[PDB]
Amino acid sequence: HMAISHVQLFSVPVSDQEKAKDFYVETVGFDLLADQPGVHGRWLQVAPKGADTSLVLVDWFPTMPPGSLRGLLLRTDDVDADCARLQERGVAVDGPKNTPWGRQAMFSDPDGNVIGLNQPS
Amino acid sequence: HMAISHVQLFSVPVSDQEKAKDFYVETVGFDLLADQPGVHGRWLQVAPKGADTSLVLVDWFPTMPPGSLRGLLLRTDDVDADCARLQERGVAVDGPKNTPWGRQAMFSDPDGNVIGLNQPS
Numbered sequence A, B: 001h002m003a004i005s006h007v008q009l010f011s012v013p014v015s016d017q018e019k020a021k022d023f024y025v026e027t028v029g030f031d032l033l034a035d036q037p038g039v040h041g042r043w044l045q046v047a048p049k050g051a052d053t054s055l056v057l058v059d060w061f062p063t064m065p066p067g068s069l070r071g072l073l074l075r076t077d078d079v080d081a082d083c084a085r086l087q088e089r090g091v092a093v094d095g096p097k098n099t100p101w102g103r104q105a106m107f108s109d110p111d112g113n114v115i116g117l118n119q120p121s
């Protein structure tokens, strides 16, 4: 058996890192974990408070153009309240809709990366 | 404040899903959470055992070509041993090398998605 415990982090491709930081921290409500020099540019790391797995807002992977990410799903304890919050902050939300795997909504970040919300049923 | 608790899952773009399943489950040692029909294709979902954030091995997002993912980092309690295991299992590993944040190695899946391993200090 391997010693891997969890995904530490994964990358979200953005163009303007300042606008992305402000979106994920101020609109989506993530904590800012780090904003410092990194190997290939500015290292900008964000996550929901208390979560094991964090997100890195990157602009240095040519195979990942800005706004190209899909299939990212965030667990929420209150999808309905979260959607209303997003709308009040000027975000176009699609949903929420009941699905077989919880009540879900989606929206986009400033670059067009698609973020999902899911509250299991 | 938003009610988001954590990333439930994110997507990794693959071509042959049966090949990716056996790589992630048998070679990398992840748990197979689910393998069933989904709305856009075969839903194939894997995770390090007991981890909150899982990975979905997908083939249906045009903006994410198979093998295009980078900047994925897995946390491990023993990077040296995991690398020895991967090599034994027929996988090329770059590293491990010490870094400012911990001791890290990288390898690629059958499509060319790049996966990091990190043992923090």
Ligand SMILES: COc1ccc2c(c1O)C(=O)c1c3c(cc(O)c1C2=O)[C@@]12O[C@@]1([C@@H](C)O)[C@H](C#C/C=C\C#C[C@H]2O)N3
Binding pocket: A010, A011, A034, A037, A038, A039, A040, A043, A056, A058, B070, B071, B072, B073, B101, B106, B115, B116, B117, B118
């Ligand atoms: C609290 O822990 C950390 C603090 C800072 C860093 C890192 C930390 O783990 C870090 O892992 C890191 C880094 C990489 C570059 C970095 O600049 C960092 C960090 O700055 C990369 O080696 C990668 C690679 C597997 O993608 C890999 C991961 C990644 C995601 C995007 C990238 C880029 C590589 O340059 N690791």
Ligand SMILES: COc1ccc2c(c1O)C(=O)c1c3c(cc(O)c1C2=O)[C@@]12O[C@@]1([C@@H](C)O)[C@H](C#C/C=C\C#C[C@H]2O)N3
Binding pocket: A070, A071, A072, A073, A101, A106, A115, A116, A117, A118, B009, B010, B011, B034, B037, B038, B039, B040, B043, B056, B058
């Ligand atoms: C153990 O819980 C689950 C079991 C099965 C599924 C899902 C589960 O959460 C599921 O969330 C799901 C689904 C979507 C399609 C699915 O087929 C599923 C599932 O089959 C999608 O709506 C997406 C969307 C945000 O991309 C969103 C998520 C995602 C990642 C890739 C995708 C695709 C959409 O087709 N949600």
